[PDB]
Amino acid sequence: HMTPQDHEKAALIMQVLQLTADQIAMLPPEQRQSILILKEQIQKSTGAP
């Protein structure tokens, strides 16, 4: 069960996202981290275990 810290990884991108945790707060946990997943795409690399 992906720790809550990992799910809070979106918060790091939350600021850059809209710049409001309140907006992201309205997002679910199964989606919050989603930002991290999408964020990874922006990085452009693809190479995870």
UniProtKB/Swiss-Prot annotation:
It is found in: Nucleus. Induction: Up-regulated during the G0 to S phase transition. Disulfide bonds: none annotated. Residues 3-49 are annotated as: Interaction with RPO2TC1. It comes from the Eukaryota. It is linked to Intellectual developmental disorder, X-linked 113: A disorder characterized by mild intellectual disability, and developmental delay mainly affecting verbal and non-verbal communication skills. Motor development is normal. One of the multiple factors required for polyadenylation and 3'-end cleavage of mammalian pre-mRNAs. This subunit is directly involved in the binding to pre-mRNAs. The CSTF complex is composed of CSTF1 (50 kDa subunit), CSTF2 (64 kDa subunit) and CSTF3 (77 kDa subunit). CSTF2 directly interacts with CSTF3, SYMPK and RPO2TC1. Interacts with HSF1 in heat-stressed cells. Interacts with CPSF2, CPSF3 and FIP1L1. Interacts with DDX1. This is Cleavage stimulation factor subunit 2. The gene is CSTF2. The chain holds residues 531 to 577 of 577 of the full protein.
